[PDB]
Design a protein around this motif. Structure first.
Motif, mmCIF file in Angstrom:
data_model
loop_
_atom_site.group_PDB
_atom_site.id
_atom_site.type_symbol
_atom_site.label_atom_id
_atom_site.label_comp_id
_atom_site.label_asym_id
_atom_site.label_seq_id
_atom_site.Cartn_x
_atom_site.Cartn_y
_atom_site.Cartn_z
ATOM 1 N N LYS A 21 40.953 47.800 41.098
ATOM 2 C CA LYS A 21 40.837 48.910 40.150
ATOM 3 C C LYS A 21 39.393 49.058 39.667
ATOM 4 C CE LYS A 21 45.626 48.924 38.607
ATOM 5 N NZ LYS A 21 46.535 49.248 37.473
ATOM 6 N N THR A 22 38.620 49.870 40.388
ATOM 7 C CA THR A 22 37.241 50.185 40.010
ATOM 8 C C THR A 22 37.216 51.232 38.896
ATOM 9 O OG1 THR A 22 37.065 51.884 41.748
ATOM 10 C CG2 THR A 22 36.309 49.658 42.300
ATOM 11 N N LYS A 82 42.684 47.456 32.302
ATOM 12 C CA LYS A 82 41.434 48.231 32.223
ATOM 13 C C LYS A 82 40.936 48.463 30.788
ATOM 14 C CE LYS A 82 44.083 52.489 32.916
ATOM 15 N NZ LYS A 82 44.110 52.875 31.475
ATOM 16 N N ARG A 139 34.614 46.352 37.948
ATOM 17 C CA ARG A 139 35.624 46.012 38.953
ATOM 18 C C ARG A 139 36.594 44.972 38.398
ATOM 19 N NH1 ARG A 139 32.063 45.586 44.670
ATOM 20 N NH2 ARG A 139 31.565 47.832 44.717
#
Lengths: 94, 200, 103, 51
Positions: free
Chosen positions: C45-46, B5, C69
RNA sequence: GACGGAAGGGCACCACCAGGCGUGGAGCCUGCGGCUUAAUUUGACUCAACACGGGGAAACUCACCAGGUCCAGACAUAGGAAUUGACAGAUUGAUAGCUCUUUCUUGAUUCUAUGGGUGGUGGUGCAUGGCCGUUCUUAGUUGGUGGAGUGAUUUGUCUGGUUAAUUCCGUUAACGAACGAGACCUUAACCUGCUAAAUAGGAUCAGGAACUUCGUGUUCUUGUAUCACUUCUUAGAGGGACUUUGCGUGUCUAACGCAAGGAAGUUUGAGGCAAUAACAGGUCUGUGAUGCCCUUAGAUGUUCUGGGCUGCACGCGCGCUACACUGAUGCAUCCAACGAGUCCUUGGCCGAUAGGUCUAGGUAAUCUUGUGAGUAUGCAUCGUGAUGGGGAUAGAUUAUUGCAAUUAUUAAUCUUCAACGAGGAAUGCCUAGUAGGCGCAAGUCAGCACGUUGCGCCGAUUACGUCCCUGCCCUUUGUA
């Protein structure tokens, strides 16, 4: 850091620019000397504030980071100060 | 390392910080866009352009600048990043080209009527389906007065907006103040249209 | 050579970029006919940011709802590491982070 | 001696890389983006809004 | 065009109806007036200013105020041959050589002056860009050729029926088109199907413990233990609703209502996206977006020490906790989903508590974590007393973050025990997993949530209409 940059450390900026032909400096004054050349970061900003206003180098901003290019009349100046052999560093050469 | 992320954020902002830089240096060059193709220990980087003459210049002068200029900043190895110029086929359809083209017509010093039709004529001739070109800001007046130019149809709404249009905005600076300049260009499998066959 | 086990991670922003890679690299394995299992699709995993639309306080307090996303997907194998380097090195995609791992 | 306090933490420590502004600093996932700066460049990063 | 306390239509819980839960009353938190002050930086003022500027300000931030520094004034022309670092006292809050009583050093970087740059959260959003809000959550808006008019303009864009809709069928000096609407995109609902998973599990087959020893009798636990599987878990491919079928309702055209079937029949629910015109809306304090003006070394640049934004005779606006017995308190029982981490924190010892200490897993479907969340349930004591409801106000102590906690950053431990007995006139929000209540997580963040943005859990009452109030859209109509 503070005060005028030594005249040896003037040539430390120029001889980096003499070889490579690029030198980018972060805008911030209190920032650490730019990665690459071991000097104060203010002294790099001061010496290329000095350089741009007598032409030679071509300044270009964006992003705080000041991406300089070195022109044909610019490489004449450094060579004279540098004493580098003429035709020492063509940008056409890889 | 960093987490995935955070990695797409760190790699994502690198695209944005790269792109606005390569807008401003290649302004008079008049580029289209950018893209990147990462491979393991050889990060390729593909510059598209309307014309290839300025960006290479002379034996790859301004290529070999922009190879050096990236790897000084972001902290790559030497010869890890490496740039390749590219020509876009059907060059009129890109919007950031035409806004940057219309900049230097106004900045040099033409009338606003004559310049904007000429930019609108090229994109219509090139084979865009429709377009518009707005010019906000003061013009023959002290109060502001936004002139608008439009020919060919242009949708505003939905997810089909974002794909089938291409849209761009720049500043341009005059004696009395700043002008705006929008361009918006509809391109050539739509939602709305249905092409039915003939049976024989 | 030796009996090994390899499980290759795939991540990107697009769906369409990985669905090229999942179809291609399994068919690239089935050139040599290795012990393939199908692509194990992990949960998405947004990522999310909500900022205000306006620069200043005025008007009604309206909000964006931005989203990324991320798509973790795992091609399974049982094969030595010298064999796999041909499959991965050809057909690298634009903007798709890929990392090969033994065990 | 002069020209430095301890500048380690709080809003005075850190600023927006794009516009040099501390206020409205989005630090989720390590952006370091001022909000006025962040919203207009959000599509170019990757963020596409829906629902 | 706009307006009408004129007509005829169609609409909205930002409007009433039928109601539900509130605010306004009380104390407290927090924003805005004022009053105060060395300074209490400043924008915005009906909806569309006022827990808004992601504005929870100890310093920083900082714009304000009382002081102190540094030039970080490019370069051109010119004099002169210059400017810097600093001990111990002096002086200063100051271990700032700032300036000094003195005397060592610095080596052409800079000083000296004139021109000119440079910089700013200085002024101007009534010079602008870009962005957002609002008009406007509604259905509306243009031009091409033709028709009408001397012309502004008009017709198309419509009597009527129908629709969430300028959406359709139809009527016609109009015909054929474009944007908006619709479509689209994302998410929520159901598939014993498709395609899979030592980073999700189930079932198996063998072992361990305990009670039973009833017997493969119930309940825990175990392994790259397996052979082999996908119902839950996850997510690619897809299927699925078309108002299909029946009966009413209509020039039976467009389409409505009701019943059955079905996971689902208000466009299946909920959002994103958002036209043309604009408004002297807001933002020069988001910006290297910027014109002009201001000032530029005795500074509005910058930065350091300290204070301030928190200062209180009193008005106004969003919230929180309350007034109790469908309750409070003490014990026990057992259930969520969204996140998020290079900081989140299990495990063992110390400590009433907070918290600390020594190991320890985690770049995360693997670790924290199946985050044992609280309304809830079961068993006790309390007895209508402002009482044990209420926890403001106030003294004293122990830890935690930081370089620094006083105007007390919080968290604890003991006390201290006010107002308030359902809130005056006014007025807000809302139609089904919705209201309301109950928690949790993220954003700003060293530390601080009574705030906002998302997430679940417990889960009602009352409408299925209307143009009376308050607004809106389209016609005919009147206007000074």
């Amino acid at each position: 850091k503070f005060s005028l940059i030594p005249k040896a450390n003037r040539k430390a900026i120029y001889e980096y620019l003499f070889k490579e032909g690029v030198i980018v400096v972060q805008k911030n004054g209190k920032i650490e000397r730019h990665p690459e050349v071991p000097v104060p970061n203010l002294h790099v900003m001061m010496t290329l504030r000095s350089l741009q206003t007598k032409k030679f180098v071509e300044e270009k901003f964006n992003w705080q980071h000041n991406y300089y290019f070195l022109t044909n009349e610019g490489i004449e100046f450094l060579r004279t100060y540098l004493h580098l052999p003429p035709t020492v560093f063509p940008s056409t050469l890889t | 390392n960093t987490c995935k992320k955070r990695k797409f954020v760190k790699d994502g902002v690198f695209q944005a910080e790269l792109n606005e830089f390569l807008s401003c240096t290649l302004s008079e060059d008049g580029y289209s866009g950018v893209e990147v193709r990462v491979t393991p220990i050889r990060t390729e980087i593909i510059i598209r352009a309307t014309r290839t003459r300025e960006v290479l210049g002379d034996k790859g002068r301004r290529i070999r600048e922009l190879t050096s200029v990236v790897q000084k900043r972001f902290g790559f190895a030497p010869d890890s990043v490496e740039l390749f110029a590219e020509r876009v086929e059907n060059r009129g359809l890109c919007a950031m080209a035409q806004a940057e083209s219309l900049r230097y017509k106004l900045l040099k010093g033409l009338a606003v009527r004559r310049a904007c039709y000429g930019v609108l004529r090229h994109i219509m001739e090139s084979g865009a389906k429709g377009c518009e070109v707005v010019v906000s800001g003061k013009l023959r007046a002290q109060r502001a007065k936004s002139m608008k130019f439009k020919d060919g149809y242009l949708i505003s709404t939905g997810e089909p907006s974002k794909m089938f249009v291409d849209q761009a905005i720049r500043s341009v600076q005059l004696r009395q103040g700043v002008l705006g300049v929008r361009v918006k260009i509809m391109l050539p499998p739509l939602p709305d249209t249905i092409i039915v066959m003939d049976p024989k | 050579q030796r009996l090994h086990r390899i499980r290759i991670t795939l991540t990107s922003k697009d769906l369409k970029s990985i669905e090229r890679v999942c179809t291609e690299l399994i068919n690239g394995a089935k050139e040599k006919n290795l012990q393939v299992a199908g692509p194990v699709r992990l949960p998405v995993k947004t990522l999310r940011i909500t900022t205000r639309k306006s620069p200043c306080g005025e008007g009604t307090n309206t909000w964006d709802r931005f989203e990324l996303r991320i798509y973790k997907r795992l091609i399974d194998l049982h094969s030595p590491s010298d064999v796999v380097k041909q499959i991965t090195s050809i057909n690298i995609d634009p903007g798709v982070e890929v990392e090969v791992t033994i065990i | 001696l002069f020209n430095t306090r301890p500048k380690k933490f709080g809003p005075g420590s850190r600023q927006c890389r794009v516009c040099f502004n501390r206020h409205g600093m989005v630090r989720k996932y390590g952006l370091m983006m001022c909000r006025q700066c962040f919203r207009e460049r959000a599509n170019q990063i990757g963020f596409v809004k829906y629902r």
